[PDB]
Amino acid sequence: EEERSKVDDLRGTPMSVGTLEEIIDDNHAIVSTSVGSEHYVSILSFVDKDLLEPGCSVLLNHKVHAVIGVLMDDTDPLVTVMKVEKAPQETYADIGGLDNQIQEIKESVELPLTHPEYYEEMGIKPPKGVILYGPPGTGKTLLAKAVANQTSATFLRVVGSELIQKYLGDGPKLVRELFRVAEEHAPSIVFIDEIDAIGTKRYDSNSGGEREIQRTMLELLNQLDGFDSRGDVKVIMATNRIETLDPALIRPGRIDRKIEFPLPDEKTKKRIFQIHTSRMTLADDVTLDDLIMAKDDLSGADIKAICTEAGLMALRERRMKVTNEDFKKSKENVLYKKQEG
Amino acid sequence: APPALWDLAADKQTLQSEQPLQVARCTKIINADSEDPKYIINVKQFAKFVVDLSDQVAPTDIEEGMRVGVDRNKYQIHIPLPPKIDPTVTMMQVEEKPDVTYSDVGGCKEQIEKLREVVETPLLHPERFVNLGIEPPKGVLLFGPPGTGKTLCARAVANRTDACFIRVIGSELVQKYVGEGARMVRELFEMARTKKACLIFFDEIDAIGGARFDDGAGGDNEVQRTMLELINQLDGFDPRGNIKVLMATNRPDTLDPALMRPGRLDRKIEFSLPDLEGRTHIFKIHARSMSVERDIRFELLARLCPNSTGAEIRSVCTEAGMFAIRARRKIATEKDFLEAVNKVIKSYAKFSATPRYMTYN
Amino acid sequence: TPNCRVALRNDSYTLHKILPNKVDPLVSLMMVEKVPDSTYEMIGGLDKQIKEIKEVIELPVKHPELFEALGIAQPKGVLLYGPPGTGKTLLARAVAHHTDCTFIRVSGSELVQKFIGEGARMVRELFVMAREHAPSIIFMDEIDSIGSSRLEGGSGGDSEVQRTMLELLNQLDGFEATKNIKVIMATNRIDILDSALLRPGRIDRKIEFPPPNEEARLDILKIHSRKMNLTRGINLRKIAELMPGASGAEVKGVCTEAGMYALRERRVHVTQEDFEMAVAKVMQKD
Amino acid sequence: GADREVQRILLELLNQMDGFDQNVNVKVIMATNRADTLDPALLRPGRLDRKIEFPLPDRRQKRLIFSTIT
Amino acid sequence: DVLPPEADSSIMMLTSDQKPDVMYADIGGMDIQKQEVREAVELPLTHFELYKQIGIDPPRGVLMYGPPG
Numbered sequence A: 001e002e003e004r005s006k007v008d009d010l011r012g013t014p015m016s017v018g019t020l021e022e023i024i025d026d027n028h029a030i031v032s033t034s035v036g037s038e039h040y041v042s043i044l045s046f047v048d049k050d051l052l053e054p055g056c057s058v059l060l061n062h063k064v065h066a067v068i069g070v071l072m073d074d075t076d077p078l079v080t081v082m083k084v085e086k087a088p089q090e091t092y093a094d095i096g097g098l099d100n101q102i103q104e105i106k107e108s109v110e111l112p113l114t115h116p117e118y119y120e121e122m123g124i125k126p127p128k129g130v131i132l133y134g135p136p137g138t139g140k141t142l143l144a145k146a147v148a149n150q151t152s153a154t155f156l157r158v159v160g161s162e163l164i165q166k167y168l169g170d171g172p173k174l175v176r177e178l179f180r181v182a183e184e185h186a187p188s189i190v191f192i193d194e195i196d197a198i199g200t201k202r203y204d205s206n207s208g209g210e211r212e213i214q215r216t217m218l219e220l221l222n223q224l225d226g227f228d229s230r231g232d233v234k235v236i237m238a239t240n241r242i243e244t245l246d247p248a249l250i251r252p253g254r255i256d257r258k259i260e261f262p263l264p265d266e267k268t269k270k271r272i273f274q275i276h277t278s279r280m281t282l283a284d285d286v287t288l289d290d291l292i293m294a295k296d297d298l299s300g301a302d303i304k305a306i307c308t309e310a311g312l313m314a315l316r317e318r319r320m321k322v323t324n325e326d327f328k329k330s331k332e333n334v335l336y337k338k339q340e341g
Numbered sequence B: 001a002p003p004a005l006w007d008l009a010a011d012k013q014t015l016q017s018e019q020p021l022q023v024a025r026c027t028k029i030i031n032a033d034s035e036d037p038k039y040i041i042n043v044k045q046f047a048k049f050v051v052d053l054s055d056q057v058a059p060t061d062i063e064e065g066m067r068v069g070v071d072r073n074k075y076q077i078h079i080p081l082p083p084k085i086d087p088t089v090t091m092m093q094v095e096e097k098p099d100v101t102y103s104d105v106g107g108c109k110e111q112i113e114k115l116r117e118v119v120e121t122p123l124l125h126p127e128r129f130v131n132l133g134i135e136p137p138k139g140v141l142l143f144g145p146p147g148t149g150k151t152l153c154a155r156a157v158a159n160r161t162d163a164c165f166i167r168v169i170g171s172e173l174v175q176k177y178v179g180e181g182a183r184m185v186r187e188l189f190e191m192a193r194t195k196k197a198c199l200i201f202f203d204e205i206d207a208i209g210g211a212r213f214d215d216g217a218g219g220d221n222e223v224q225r226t227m228l229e230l231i232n233q234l235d236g237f238d239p240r241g242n243i244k245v246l247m248a249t250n251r252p253d254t255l256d257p258a259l260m261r262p263g264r265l266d267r268k269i270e271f272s273l274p275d276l277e278g279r280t281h282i283f284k285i286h287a288r289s290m291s292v293e294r295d296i297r298f299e300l301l302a303r304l305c306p307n308s309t310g311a312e313i314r315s316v317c318t319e320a321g322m323f324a325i326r327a328r329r330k331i332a333t334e335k336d337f338l339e340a341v342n343k344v345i346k347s348y349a350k351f352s353a354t355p356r357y358m359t360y361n
Numbered sequence C: 001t002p003n004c005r006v007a008l009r010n011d012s013y014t015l016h017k018i019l020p021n022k023v024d025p026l027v028s029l030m031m032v033e034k035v036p037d038s039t040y041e042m043i044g045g046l047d048k049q050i051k052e053i054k055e056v057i058e059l060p061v062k063h064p065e066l067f068e069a070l071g072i073a074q075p076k077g078v079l080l081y082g083p084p085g086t087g088k089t090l091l092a093r094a095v096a097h098h099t100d101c102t103f104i105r106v107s108g109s110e111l112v113q114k115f116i117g118e119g120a121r122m123v124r125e126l127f128v129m130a131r132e133h134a135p136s137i138i139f140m141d142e143i144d145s146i147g148s149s150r151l152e153g154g155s156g157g158d159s160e161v162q163r164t165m166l167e168l169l170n171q172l173d174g175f176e177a178t179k180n181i182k183v184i185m186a187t188n189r190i191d192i193l194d195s196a197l198l199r200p201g202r203i204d205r206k207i208e209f210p211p212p213n214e215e216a217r218l219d220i221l222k223i224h225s226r227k228m229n230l231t232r233g234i235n236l237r238k239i240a241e242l243m244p245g246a247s248g249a250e251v252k253g254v255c256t257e258a259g260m261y262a263l264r265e266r267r268v269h270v271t272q273e274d275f276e277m278a279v280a281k282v283m284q285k286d
Numbered sequence D: 001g002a003d004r005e006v007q008r009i010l011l012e013l014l015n016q017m018d019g020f021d022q023n024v025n026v027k028v029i030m031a032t033n034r035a036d037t038l039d040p041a042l043l044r045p046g047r048l049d050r051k052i053e054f055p056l057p058d059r060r061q062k063r064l065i066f067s068t069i070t
Numbered sequence E: 001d002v003l004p005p006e007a008d009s010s011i012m013m014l015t016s017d018q019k020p021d022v023m024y025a026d027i028g029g030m031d032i033q034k035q036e037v038r039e040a041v042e043l044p045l046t047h048f049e050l051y052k053q054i055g056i057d058p059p060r061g062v063l064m065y066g067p068p069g
């Protein structure tokens, strides 16, 4: 009512947007705005003074440098990288052969949060995350378990050591903010895939050095260990080669669960071809036995790419049904690809 | 809305109080004293002003390098400001509230005792050591196997008697644009001296303790500044520093910090780590969780996993009820989980046995 | 709307007027710099190859309603490997020119980092510009050199760009949205083997970049010869056979640099001899 | 940041010379002791189309360099 | 009102009339660099239309490197 028509005359019309430097128990707050300016602000209104804390943005009324209201504005560089969303149409039911592998991780990710009643009454509580890996180049097949996880709660994916070591640091602080922002969005899932920090050869741009790289990773462990945060921000690690990472990383996490990705057998590969070709239309003469017999140590995306190139070649004839001669001639292209060099 | 109603209704008295002190801009550092009435002062505005002070402030209270308020019109000194340094790095350095009480110990006795008397007893009974002094020691050093790194400090958090202490993370000392760590390490010391006996703890000193010299090129120069400025500011004579010390890392390396500590530090202890008869103690703490059958023997299971510290046997108690949920069992029978416990120790030792003993060896 | 120029009044400090701003023009600045337009009429010899890339690029732009009919996923990216050569850079913006979609290049120095955010992963905020404007084509420019042929510093140095396209394709397939976003590789050898070590044959489109050929030299010779006044007594058959190997960019060296001798001779029309001069000029440095 | 602004000023003159395209008029000659620090955008064709490298003196140049000083 | 032009500001122009030191008879060694530079400098500057005749766009870009010498 009258207060809205009162306090507005004090702040307006012009006002500046500064930053909070430090607070004094005398209700005088020291503000800093562009460029390099200080002051004593004491206001009893709209505060919220305890939730502000130094290091946040505050308004400045021209007369005289008073803060009428609080502003939390994001935006921010890091907040942009977490969303959105995906909520992908794919599910954990579109993959097969890892049922024995997936059972434990699916359980472990749905162990907390959803289905809490048997979890909370048992008093186990293993909230250190999970650790993934496999050969030869998989780990995306383990990401095919992250899509099902993207269907539940909140998800964030941070991959590759380039985002830290491309320039000088400041080291982990880029990760340190990911922890806290995920705490503000808790519960959320943070997935990290292919950690090359110790496996990289040449750093990006001009930065050093091999041992500083290690120290930012070690501070990542203490962040992850950790002292002292109980929040999740559930963390999942994944890579191709676990031997590169130091055993110093395993005790803090993941001490309870780590999975290994086995190579698929004949029955699994048959399932894989089934799931991809479900949407595709194939000729009657295409058989699933000879295909998986001729292939040796191939993942889902390989049998995927051969079908993609079969349909691409079938587009030259503008045919939606891929014949077995076209399928085999297309298969020979990726077969010659891996066998050329 | 009612609290915001009364919150916005105090601006009528606030605007009357808004006339004074709102011209106090800005904060300015003094330079020299030519005489008693007149002082030269510098401000961030880049204009250095020589000016007098207000008659409400005693001139004997202003010492060189004290920041004070100013009435821009007359430029005279208004009110001094105690706080000076630093931006948000300090507030991030500060920690509060307890957790992880003493009941969370895994059976270590002589360890926890000998480190209790270095820190907690001097501040618990100060008159005792001053009477019978001699003098309490400066501080300690922690390291060894991972179980249990860094949790022992949480014990001091919950056992802290009155004044909270500050914990510090190691890797934040070293930063891009060399010369930021110099200000960094210095300011927290002055803060501590105002904090009257508050504790400062650096984790993973091995990151900033890289020793010593290499051919070329530095390299360790920006590292050596951090450590050596640390030790130099640690070897100052005033006070110094009453705030005691606390240190922890992983490996005993490197030699330079290790050769500098025994002069200024003492009481280096090594883990220990679960003794045979002590391994069961971790099982006694974790026994309060879930439900322990009266026929379960902890001493039998404990010998089957040497060198596992407390983490791995925590995952033992964890995988008990974990695999019990999948089998719908409410309580974990001793014979049920051990079949998965030999598997959970061996299968995780297959790729790596976790040789922390080899990390420093 | 944010990020628009607006007049500011003196008294109330209000918004007097609305004025237009420039944000993409700074992007297209380096764009038109780094690459010209080069429509299909300015390229020759890749007819067989542009046939291959046409179905890859045009399908998500125009056809996709048949994608679900054939149950085939959209292609994520494509690569061009072969001795330079030229046109692999031109073809990208040529297809994008006929697609009307915006053309975006990777780093980019220096000034792609400042224009887009302050500091970050740098593969996200850029992707936020490509999300703002779709469809858009992403190109890898360039880090193709013999420098940089060591496979020690050169590999690990470009392998962060290979990690760029890795995590970008990992984005496209894993999360975010939606289609039309593609990546193009232009390089020759060496780190092609490192990318196929990072690419376990999964997934990408394989397109070879061919060396210049005789019959490929004829038509392209005429193409670059379209802008310089000359008589018709010039035999394009014999002149192309004299230049085996070399590169695509050598064609322009021939034509252009031959023009200077004619300008020294003051002749308005050039002669066959004068072009055959610059032939030798470009064969001495080889 | 002012150095970055003056290299965006180098880009701004890089834009102004596009203002000079075409015909009338300007002439820009450029030399450097080390070309490894130059950004590819400057050496890119369309703006600096000529790269002239100073060769090490040779026998033909020896006799000329001796005649001129003598 | 705007600048005439041109009254500057800074630098300034001229100052080169009382200079330069010596003519080109000094350095006679190169002869392959001068043929490039001369054709890339004085020829486009003297005749602008001669380039438009033949249909070649004269560049303004001149880059030098190699020292020492």
Ligand SMILES: Nc1ncnc2c1ncn2[C@@H]1O[C@H](COP(=O)(O)OP(=O)(O)OP(=O)(O)O)[C@@H](O)[C@H]1O
Binding pocket: A094, A095, A096, A097, A098, A137, A138, A139, A140, A141, A144, A194, A268, A271, A272, A275, A299, A300, A301, A302, C166, C170, C198, C200, C202, C203
């Ligand atoms: N049993 C299965 N059923 C269905 N799909 C499968 C199965 N196994 C694997 N896949 C699919 O095969 C793909 C394999 O991905 P791939 O390992 O080729 O990724 P990648 O390119 O190696 O990733 P990165 O480069 O990040 O390691 C997965 O996306 C997964 O969806």
Ligand SMILES: Nc1ncnc2c1ncn2[C@@H]1O[C@H](COP(=O)(O)OP(=O)(O)OP(=O)(O)O)[C@@H](O)[C@H]1O
Binding pocket: A225, A226, A251, A252, B104, B105, B106, B107, B143, B144, B145, B146, B147, B148, B149, B150, B151, B249, B250, B273, B274, B282, B309, B310, B311, B314
């Ligand atoms: N002997 C023990 N008594 C009680 N708890 C233990 C013991 N050993 C391990 N733990 C528990 O195991 C958990 C994991 O230890 P943690 O990984 O934090 O050690 P760390 O800090 O990594 O060691 P370091 O700092 O040396 O690397 C700790 O929270 C700790 O409570």
Ligand SMILES: Nc1ncnc2c1ncn2[C@@H]1O[C@H](COP(=O)(O)OP(=O)(O)OP(=O)(O)O)[C@@H](O)[C@H]1O
Binding pocket: C043, C044, C045, C084, C085, C086, C087, C088, C089, C090, C091, C144, C186, C220, C247, C248, C249, C250, C251, C252
């Ligand atoms: N097929 C071709 N034959 C001859 N010249 C060509 C051909 N394609 C392009 N060029 C010329 O080469 C120049 C550069 O083209 P483009 O940018 O595609 O190659 P580039 O990527 O610069 O070469 P590089 O890979 O060596 O950097 C263009 O000005 C064009 O006139």
